[PDB]
Design a protein around this nucleic acid. Structure first.
Length: 69
RNA sequence: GGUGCUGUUUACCAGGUCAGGUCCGAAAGGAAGCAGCCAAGGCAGUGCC
Protein backbone atom coordinates (compact mmCIF):
# COMPACT_ATOMS: atom_id res chain seq x y z
CA UNK A 1 0.00 0.00 0.00
CA UNK A 2 1.59 3.26 -1.19
CA UNK A 3 0.60 6.82 -2.10
CA UNK A 4 -0.52 5.67 -5.54
CA UNK A 5 -3.17 3.53 -3.90
CA UNK A 6 -4.12 6.16 -1.34
CA UNK A 7 -4.69 8.36 -4.39
CA UNK A 8 -7.22 5.90 -5.84
CA UNK A 9 -9.28 6.86 -2.81
CA UNK A 10 -15.01 18.29 -1.62
CA UNK A 11 -11.44 19.06 -0.54
CA UNK A 12 -10.31 15.72 -1.96
CA UNK A 13 -9.27 17.73 -5.02
CA UNK A 14 -6.70 19.55 -2.91
CA UNK A 15 -5.18 16.28 -1.73
CA UNK A 16 -4.85 14.92 -5.25
CA UNK A 17 -2.95 18.08 -6.18
CA UNK A 18 -0.41 17.41 -3.42
CA UNK A 19 0.14 13.78 -4.41
CA UNK A 20 0.22 15.02 -8.02
CA UNK A 21 3.29 17.16 -7.29
CA UNK A 22 5.30 14.15 -6.22
CA UNK A 23 7.66 12.03 -8.27
CA UNK A 24 7.04 8.34 -8.81
CA UNK A 25 9.66 7.33 -6.26
CA UNK A 26 8.13 9.58 -3.60
CA UNK A 27 4.75 8.00 -4.18
CA UNK A 28 6.24 4.50 -3.92
CA UNK A 29 8.62 4.94 -0.98
CA UNK A 30 6.94 7.84 0.95
CA UNK A 31 9.55 7.79 3.71
CA UNK A 32 12.14 9.40 1.46
CA UNK A 33 10.00 12.54 1.70
CA UNK A 34 11.80 14.92 4.01
CA UNK A 35 12.02 18.70 4.32
CA UNK A 36 13.40 19.79 0.96
CA UNK A 37 11.00 17.55 -0.97
CA UNK A 38 8.00 18.73 1.06
CA UNK A 39 9.13 22.25 0.30
CA UNK A 40 9.03 21.38 -3.41
CA UNK A 41 5.72 19.50 -3.33
CA UNK A 42 3.82 22.11 -1.31
CA UNK A 43 4.94 24.97 -3.55
CA UNK A 44 4.34 22.79 -6.61
CA UNK A 45 0.70 22.33 -5.63
CA UNK A 46 0.05 25.88 -4.42
CA UNK A 47 -0.08 24.46 -0.91
CA UNK A 48 2.03 24.67 2.23
CA UNK A 49 4.24 22.20 4.03
CA UNK A 50 1.73 21.93 6.89
CA UNK A 51 -0.81 20.86 4.25
CA UNK A 52 1.62 18.26 2.90
CA UNK A 53 2.42 16.95 6.37
CA UNK A 54 -1.29 16.60 7.06
CA UNK A 55 -1.73 14.60 3.85
CA UNK A 56 1.34 12.51 4.69
CA UNK A 57 -0.15 11.90 8.14
CA UNK A 58 -3.51 10.81 6.74
CA UNK A 59 -1.78 8.40 4.40
CA UNK A 60 0.26 7.12 7.33
CA UNK A 61 -2.78 6.27 9.46
CA UNK A 62 -4.27 4.65 6.36
CA UNK A 63 -1.13 2.54 6.05
CA UNK A 64 -0.72 1.64 9.72
CA UNK A 65 -4.42 0.75 9.78
CA UNK A 66 -3.95 -1.75 6.94
CA UNK A 67 -0.49 -2.70 8.20
CA UNK A 68 -2.59 -4.30 10.94
CA UNK A 69 -4.79 -6.79 9.10
C1' G B 1 37.96 14.88 -26.11
C1' G B 2 34.31 15.94 -30.59
C1' U B 3 30.32 13.88 -33.07
C1' G B 4 26.45 9.84 -34.05
C1' C B 5 23.83 5.65 -32.28
C1' U B 6 22.12 2.41 -28.51
C1' G B 7 21.37 0.89 -23.26
C1' U B 8 21.01 3.09 -18.46
C1' U B 9 20.59 6.94 -14.88
C1' U B 10 18.96 12.05 -12.82
C1' A B 11 13.12 15.20 -6.66
C1' C B 12 14.04 21.00 -6.01
C1' C B 13 19.03 23.87 -6.72
C1' A B 14 17.69 30.43 -12.90
C1' G B 15 16.33 24.54 -20.03
C1' G B 16 11.10 24.21 -22.83
C1' U B 17 6.21 22.94 -22.01
C1' C B 18 3.33 22.69 -18.12
C1' A B 19 -2.06 18.16 -16.58
C1' G B 20 -3.35 18.91 -11.62
C1' G B 21 -3.22 22.71 -7.82
C1' U B 22 -1.73 27.80 -6.48
C1' C B 23 -1.43 33.50 -6.99
C1' C B 24 -3.25 38.43 -8.69
C1' G B 25 -7.95 40.55 -10.95
C1' A B 26 -15.26 42.42 -10.12
C1' A B 27 -14.27 40.67 -14.91
C1' A B 28 -11.55 40.50 -19.24
C1' G B 29 -7.53 38.38 -18.45
C1' G B 30 -2.53 38.11 -16.25
C1' A B 31 1.64 35.62 -13.06
C1' A B 32 4.62 31.84 -11.04
C1' G B 33 4.97 26.76 -11.61
C1' C B 34 5.45 20.75 -9.09
C1' A B 35 4.84 15.82 -11.30
C1' G B 36 4.96 14.28 -16.48
C1' C B 37 6.89 14.85 -20.99
C1' C B 38 10.71 16.72 -24.30
C1' A B 39 15.30 18.32 -23.94
C1' A B 40 19.88 18.37 -21.15
C1' G B 41 23.53 16.09 -17.91
C1' G B 42 25.76 11.61 -15.47
C1' C B 43 27.63 6.17 -16.42
C1' A B 44 28.84 2.89 -20.15
C1' G B 45 29.29 0.22 -25.25
C1' U B 46 29.85 0.67 -30.68
C1' G B 47 31.01 3.84 -35.35
C1' C B 48 33.31 8.06 -37.33
C1' C B 49 37.04 12.59 -36.62
Amino acid sequence: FDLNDFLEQKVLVRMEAIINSMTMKERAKPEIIKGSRKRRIAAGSGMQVQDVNRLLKQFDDMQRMMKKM
